[PDB]
């Protein structure tokens, strides 16, 4: 069959979403959440809603799209892994001046078929050892149905400006001009400028760019490129974006207030946590119903290396992700000081 | 004037000790502490008071020690001011200084003259002891062989080439057999020490495979964050920090206490016989393969208010024993 995102029940999907949950605490004893909890949302079910599965079990959206590539392919399917983080079973050293990007490109020459999985997950995937790796941050996943084209220029670009770092690759028998063949050589091309944007489409037609900045990219990614990019201001009013000292309690002692929660509970998924436990990769803009998922966090500082976004319209999941937020005062402050409080975190 | 520690009234000491506070939030108007309030001690005061100083403030141990170094050498006063940083192919900053005419030295733990990196955050301790030329000496043979420093802005004060001071200058190329090291030393005032010192090949807990073994005491470590703790649920399905460990020092007369993971916490005393250890390496289990050390030295007043600034601050609804239980599951690989 040809390459594809899988759903929550191992059928083809041309594009799907997950949020998965970090390990949270009741104590030394106990979990409230494991970190493989997870909602889901694709265009088919129409609503972000906890998944009934985990995310390390040999079911969901995740396990059967992976194992629709790394499971039993044919003699022309392959992928392409790559990670600054390398799995232990490449058994080699990561070259720290790579894209800080992280994703599966799979396909299948005699169908014309790819998938793209974008993740955040170090060291992973690999397509021999089974599970899935830390669960201590919540995480965003994008999974869209590509024609083996779209998967080529997109590799081409990849190749200029993200440049990942590729592992463990497996050719199909890929004809060596291919691009996503030269995405398995090593990475030499200059790059023009410091930024690139492309438009694509999913099999199934739906829209989505790619926002990449290359290793000489200094500004602010989401304020001075992906916003302008989109011609939408991206809503980063209370955006995390820097550390926050302790704060004074009522007892005379400084402690960690977090603030800026994300809360999934008005999506079935009973829980909230700090924002400083979530990669925060994601993004969403004020206007036009933007959601941008990830290699990029953020945080005011950022290495100079190679990565990007995914951008794409969705009222659904734009609406889910807005009422995500959750302020908290510390202790004795407003809901207005709070907000002041982490705007503090976008200045130096 | 031979080379020596400065107490917080530019008179000569043997040996002083200082904890300086990390930056800390009142509200949007105001800092409790700006992060450079701090607590001092020498055996002349013989109690860890609040400082009426800040750290940075031209006054106070460490600026009349550094000044008394730096401000104004003289021609055989020479310096080498190192650091962990890996060799080439955020860190814990020392400084030895010697004048040879005069056969004096001082080490200072954790600081270096502003002017080698000029312009808060987090709780930082600071250490300084009189030695003399020869002591000095044996100490930078150590770390030619062990700790290996990176080292910046020396200044040799005409030291010949044959001196382990000089040596330590110059490019380490030692790989020394074994993965550790400790030797005995005294102050100028005969104050006894240990530095105790790992190399790149250490593998195992610098505290308690390497530092308690040598001083033949447990390192008190049953109240360290040695890890990262999960959010804690708090009600309703909303997790939050919960820092359950804190350095409190309102005891020793400054209004302060914050979560030990806003501290450096690179010190530690032992459970038994007054040991007080400040050094490179601090209490994580993850750690980098690097060379380092710690100072250790017994001190029973000292030891006593290091002791006891911890503080245990339960999640909600949690026991004593259920949040020690948390910050012990921190000691997991
Ligand atoms: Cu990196
Ligand atoms: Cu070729
Ligand atoms: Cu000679």
Same mark, same amino acid.
């Given at each position: 069959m040809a390459i594809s995102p899988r759903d929550e029940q191992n059928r083809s999907v041309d594009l799907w979403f997950a949020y998965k949950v970090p390990k949270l605490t009741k104590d030394a004893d106990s979990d409230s959440a494991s970190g493989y909890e997870y909602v889901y949302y694709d265009r088919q079910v129409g609503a972000v809603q906890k998944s009934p599965?985990?995310?390390? &079990? $040999?079911?969901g959206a995740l396990f059967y799209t992976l194992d629709s590539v790394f499971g039993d392919p044919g003699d022309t399917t392959g992928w392409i892994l790559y990670n600054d983080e390398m799995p232990a079973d490449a058994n080699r050293s990561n070259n720290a001046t790579l894209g800080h990007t992280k994703g599966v490109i799979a396909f299948d020459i005699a169908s014309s078929s790819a998938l793209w999985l974008l993740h955040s997950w170090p060291?992973?995937?690999? $397509?021999?050892?089974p599970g899935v790796p830390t669960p201590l941050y919540g995480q965003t996943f994008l999974c869209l149905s590509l024609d083996l084209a779209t998967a080529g220029k997109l590799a081409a670009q990849m190749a200029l400006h993200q440049q990942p770092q590729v592992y463990l690759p497996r050719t199909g028998g890929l004809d060596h001009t291919s691009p996503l063949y030269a995405l398995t050589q090593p990475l030499n091309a200059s790059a023009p400028g410091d930024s690139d944007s492309l438009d694509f489409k999913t099999r199934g037609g739906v829209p989505f760019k790619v926002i990449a900045k290359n290793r000489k990219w200094g500004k &602010?990614?989401?304020? &001075?490129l992906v916003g302008p990019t989109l011609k939408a201001d991206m809503?980063?009013?209370?955006?995390?974006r820097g550390k926050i000292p302790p704060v004074l309690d009522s007892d005379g002692v400084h402690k960690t207030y977090d603030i800026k929660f994300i809360d999934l509970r008005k999506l079935g998924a009973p829980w909230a946590w700090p924002?400083?436990? &979530?990669?925060?990769?994601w993004g969403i803009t004020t206007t036009d119903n933007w959601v941008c998922v990830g290699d990029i966090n953020r945080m005011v500082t950022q290495e100079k290396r190679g990565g990007g976004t995914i951008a794409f319209q969705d009222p659904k999941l734009w609406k889910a992700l807005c009422e995500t937020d959750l302020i908290i005062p510390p202790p004795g402050k407003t809901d207005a000081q709070a907000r002041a409080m982490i705007r503090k975190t976008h200045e130096p």
């Open positions: 599965n985990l995310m390390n &079990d $040999p079911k060291k992973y995937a690999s $397509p021999s050892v &602010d990614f989401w304020n &001075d809503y980063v009013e209370t955006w995390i924002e400083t436990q &979530d990669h925060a990769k």
